[PDB]
Amino acid sequence: AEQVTKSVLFVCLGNICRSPIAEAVFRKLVTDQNISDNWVIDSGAVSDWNVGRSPDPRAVSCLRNHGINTAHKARQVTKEDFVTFDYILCMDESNLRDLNRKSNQVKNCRAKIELLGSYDPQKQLIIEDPYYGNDADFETVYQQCVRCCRAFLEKVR
Ligand code: MOO
């Protein structure tokens, strides 16, 4: 079992509710497919407001309900991210304009930046901020994440 190494960065505004869920769903898929060793995975924020913070408690419990754990600490997206990751997947059109803006300040930008929801077989393009929502909204984000992450993986696998 030998291949090449792929990397993906999951991105949200704060890296406290959405991307940590995406990122953790993503590792599980990869681990379950016995391909971890070929993947570098990470999650980051457009904003610095919450760096160093743990994931929101409702995101932790949501993942737990699904047999998944995370140990992530929020971090900000940097310019190196644009040259180090194959893919940068974000949650919403805002994250998307924000990143295209930064990447510009990047000379040899080698990351492909897209909406994770662009991979959704159900077509729900956007992954909504569940911050002000309830446990049900966390769950629906998880759900989207699984759909989108399996769809992305079968294609870059
Ligand atoms: O981490 Mo977020 O950008 O509040 O879902």
Side-chain angles (χ1 to χ4, degrees), residues 27-86:
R27 295 196 182 279
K28 174 65 175 152
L29 293 181
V30 167
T31 289
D32 291 341
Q33 298 175 17
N34 277 298
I35 57 184
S36 270
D37 309 308
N38 296 298
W39 275 96
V40 183
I41 298 164
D42 199 4
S43 63
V46 172
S47 169
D48 58 3
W49 184 250
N50 306 104
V51 330
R53 287 184 171 246
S54 299
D56 180 294
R58 292 160 302 167
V60 176
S61 43
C62 166
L63 257 5
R64 278 48 198 190
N65 287 343
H66 296 91
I68 298 171
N69 292 285
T70 177
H72 196 76
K73 281 176 57 53
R75 75 163 184 103
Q76 179 191 318
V77 173
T78 68
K79 294 173 193 168
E80 302 70 11
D81 282 332
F82 301 106
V83 294
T84 60
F85 290 89
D86 293 338

Side-chain angles (χ1 to χ4, degrees), residues 89-134:
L89 307 164
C90 65
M91 310 297 150
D92 69 36
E93 85 218 33
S94 284
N95 301 149
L96 193 80
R97 304 157 200 157
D98 287 325
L99 308 161
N100 284 308
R101 193 169 65 237
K102 276 195 271 302
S103 66
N104 284 150
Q105 304 166 337
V106 180
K107 184 174 188 285
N108 356 50
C109 180
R110 87 87 186 288
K112 181 182 180 193
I113 306 166
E114 33 178 16
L115 285 175
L116 166 64
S118 82
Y119 285 91
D120 186 8
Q122 297 186 162
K123 311 267 185 283
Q124 319 204 170
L125 273 186
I126 142 157
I127 303 179
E128 312 282 344
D129 181 346
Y131 187 81
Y132 299 103
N134 53 22

Side-chain angles (χ1 to χ4, degrees), residues 12-20 50 91 95 128-131:
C12 78
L13 184 59
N15 189 206
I16 62 175
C17 311
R18 293 171 303 172
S19 48
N50 306 104
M91 310 297 150
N95 301 149
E128 312 282 344
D129 181 346
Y131 187 81

